[PDB]
Amino acid sequence: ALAATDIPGLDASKLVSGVLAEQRLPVFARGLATAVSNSSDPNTATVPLMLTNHANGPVAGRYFYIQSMFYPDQNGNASQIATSYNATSEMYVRVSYAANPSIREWLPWQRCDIGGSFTKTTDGSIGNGVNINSFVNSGWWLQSTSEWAAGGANYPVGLAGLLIVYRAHADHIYQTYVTLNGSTYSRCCYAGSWRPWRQNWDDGNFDPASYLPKAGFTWAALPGKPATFPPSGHNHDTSQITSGILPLARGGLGANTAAGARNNIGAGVPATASRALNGWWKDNDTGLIVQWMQVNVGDHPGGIIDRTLTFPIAFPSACLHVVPTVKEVGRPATSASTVTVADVSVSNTGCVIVSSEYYGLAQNYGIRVMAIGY
Amino acid sequence: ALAATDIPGLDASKLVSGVLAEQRLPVFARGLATAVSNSSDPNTATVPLMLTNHANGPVAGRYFYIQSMFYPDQNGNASQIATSYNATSEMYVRVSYAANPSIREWLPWQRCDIGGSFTKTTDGSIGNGVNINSFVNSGWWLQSTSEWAAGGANYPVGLAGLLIVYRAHADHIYQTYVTLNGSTYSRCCYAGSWRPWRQNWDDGNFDPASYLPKAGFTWAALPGKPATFPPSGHNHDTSQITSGILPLARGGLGANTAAGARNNIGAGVPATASRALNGWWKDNDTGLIVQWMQVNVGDHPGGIIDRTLTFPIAFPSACLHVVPTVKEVGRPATSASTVTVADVSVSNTGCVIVSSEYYGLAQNYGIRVMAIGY
Amino acid sequence: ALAATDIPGLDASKLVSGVLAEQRLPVFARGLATAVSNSSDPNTATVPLMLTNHANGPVAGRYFYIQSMFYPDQNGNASQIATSYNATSEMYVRVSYAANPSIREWLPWQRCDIGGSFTKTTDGSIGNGVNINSFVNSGWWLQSTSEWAAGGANYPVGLAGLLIVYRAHADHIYQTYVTLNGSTYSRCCYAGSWRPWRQNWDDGNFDPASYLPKAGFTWAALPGKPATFPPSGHNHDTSQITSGILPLARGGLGANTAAGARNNIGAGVPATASRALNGWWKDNDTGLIVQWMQVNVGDHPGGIIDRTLTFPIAFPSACLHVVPTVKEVGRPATSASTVTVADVSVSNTGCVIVSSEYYGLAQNYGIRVMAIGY
Ligand SMILES: [Fe+3]
Ligand SMILES: [Mg+2]
Ligand code: NA
Ligand code: NA
Ligand code: NA
């Protein structure tokens, strides 16, 4: 009856068949994270699986399962995958590579689950009465209900929309909001203070067709211009006065005729005359005519003498008066004053003068006559 | 010769050398996902590797390889990594933790491959003839060609650009389009109905410098104004009539001189006169002068008496007529009618009058003379 | 003493206790990536762990640890997880599946680390002096400092902001810049050439209230309109001349009264007259009045006869001259020339004429008188 102590040391090639009970394997080959203490330094890992909250892990204060893959030996270069132990589902990866693989140089852990990314699924649907100032973390959310935007706080407008947040830094937080009608608003939380929502102009809130182009600002295009304009002070030439008759109040004649002009200023026409020895003078205002004339007779023989004298011109209507006097042509014997005259008759053409003497001597007398008529 | 049945049970320490043939290993330590049935529940996993389409996997109806890492034993807390079996290359991670690790509390699967996120590579390049209404899934796509945007359907404009899509919910899908020239449009599919593209105003489609500011709207700034304006009804003062000579047809004199005025209205100048006993009267229209005068002589002694009379003023040209008569200054003895007269000669300065009597008593006569000339 | 060579081939079930020293395990079960050459093709992987830079790995030229999980055997279908060996921390996954699992059909490698995604942490903060043309890779970056944007190159504006980049393709790169005040600019590098930044109009750079609506472009609304306007040429009627007195220089009377007018043109007033046998004539220029009259007497009874004659009108001031002559009414016995006359006295209303005869016969004479005065 052979005992184990009777069996010599064997090479692994002696197991020619069968499958080992998994209890014969080191724990790390069974998926058990129990090979090393649960605070082991993953930087100095030599086992392919551990569970540790060591600070060289990816998240301070948290446990992670850490798988390790090694080359050229378990002290050399390595790749590590860390997966969370509790609280959340997270994965990270890192690597150590060095020319001397034992002098490990670990790169930073890199996140391997989309929990650190902008995801194709939305981060959430926002309810009513929410203050958008609290959305200080990167992501994108839906506001499905305009009333819920209106019922909230710090929405740019009371409309359903899409909120996108970029948290670049605690002091630089950018938010964008796009309404269900396509309008964009943007604001930033700069150094802890939210700046005003900036509103883009779009074809839903501005129409330049309602506003006047500079090219349309012209006199020709101005509507409502009156036909005539109050004139400022200006002068004129008489040639520009084209109708009417200027009255006496304005220094005018009050009429457009010579006779009417004289009548309105009380002026009279000039006189006409023939300045001859047998001449005349006419006042055309009244039509009165005054003529004078003289005739040479000679001696008065005695008794009574009648003579007809013809006026320089005929009186149009009548002779009103005659004034006969005696002229001395010569003084042969006595003066012509010894002859006296008187008018016998008058007509429009002339008169008849009678003469007589009171000395029976010779004379050379003439008859002067002045007449008045119209 | 010994048979295997003669050999007792051996401890693992009996293998002192060599590398086990991998066929001796539990299948999971060889990478074989054959340890359990392919519908096993990963929630109850006790093996480090399985392949299962059980509902508790990450994607309904699909097979996944699921790795499990356990602590403190294979019935306790666990971390799981699921990788796809076919169709796509996907990875998920989850975890179970509990105070009593045997009473597992699984968290939801978290996706690891970037297929679930907005990726730094584009989701694709859009060809010609595509209807953008069909892009209802989150992502971003490239339209490389303006002609293909024009040849498609429901692009905001026929220009190459970038399309970004946010499927926030089946009834809330947001699209943004940025053209190659920087112009942004936005629209939303609300409850399955696409709303109109909203077009932002930018310096590519709007120039405020082309529109008139209110501050530039003034009379002084209005271009195209006329130099003069058609006047409306107004009045004037004579002082504004500054040039020209008003014609008779309008009530004017038709001349700028007093002589020309009289000539144009047919008016004559006024007469002058010296209204004295020995006086004169002149018609300045014709120049005719009439004079009258008297002198006291006294008694007529007899015979023929000559006396010279000097006109008040001298006739400038010639005397045309004289009218002598007799005046009675007094009647000391007899009346002056007994004396008669006649004119002998006449000059420009006066005349000579001859007198005779027919009664021989003492008279006191004078001589009156009236003269006409020019 | 039993020799190992005397021990028969054993089944794995002979190992009833203990844990194998890990040196007994195939290397891949120890986390060692040394089972195959480090250029082995992962498409033909039959071991669960290798390290290779073969072209069929995820990133050309780079080494990756490649884990494999197999079904139904190590030649069949497989899932593979690749993790980086150096330089960066990266993870990838792929799969092979086919109806005949041993004739593999590999799907493309899919990335798992968030390095391939838009992440919820920014890609970096930009310093001063940076040219944004170099940002040709997808991501989002922070410009914290307006001075650093001004001090850089190819920023749209010298303001702090957020830079978002979409590298769709080497020929299609889109950039968006959102300033800390909420203003958005966009540009595109198209086929290797950057195009100008496009500036959106928003309420921070454009206020329509400053610009004039078309509705406000009206004559009534235009400010600064003058009260009066320079008139163009026009004509007038005399009635529009409502004040002033036209002077002689312009063809006017220089006066608004008849008398004044006459004086300014040097004109005289009309004469008046009573054209009767006992009539008168008046020169209203000088006021001189000339009268003529006649009275029939009959016979002269001898002696001295005085007779009063009354002037047709009274001289307003004085009678300056009378001219008496003798008229013949008839010739009964001798002529009226045998009667002579002379004036005795004169008044404003009449005169006294004395008469005598040098015959002693019957006459029928009258007295004519012409008078001058004012
Ligand atoms: Fe005017
Ligand atoms: Mg006159
Ligand atoms: Na005689
Ligand atoms: Na005597
Ligand atoms: Na008698």
Author numbering:
A (entry chain B), B (entry chain C), C (entry chain A): 328 to 701
Task: Quote the original article.
Morphologically and functionally, the R-type pyocins resemble the contractile tails of Myoviridae bacteriophages. We found that both R1 and R2 pyocin fiber fragments form a ~240 Å-long homotrimer that contains a rod-like and a shaft-like domain, two tandem knob domains, and the C-terminal lectin-like domain.
The iron-binding site has an octahedral geometry and is composed of six histidine residues—three symmetry-related copies of His561 and His563 in R1 and His562 and His564 in R2. In addition to the buried metal ions, the R1 and R2 fibers contain solvent exposed sodium and calcium ions, respectively, bound to the tip of the C-terminal lectin domain. A flat and nearly perfectly triangular density is located on the axis of the Knob2 of the R1 fiber, but no such feature is present in the R2. The deviation of the “molecule’s” axis from the threefold axis of the fiber is more prominent in the Knob2 domain of the R1 fiber. The calcium cavity of R2 is located on the interface of two polypeptide chains and is much deeper than the sodium cavity of R1, which is formed by residues belonging to the same polypeptide chain.
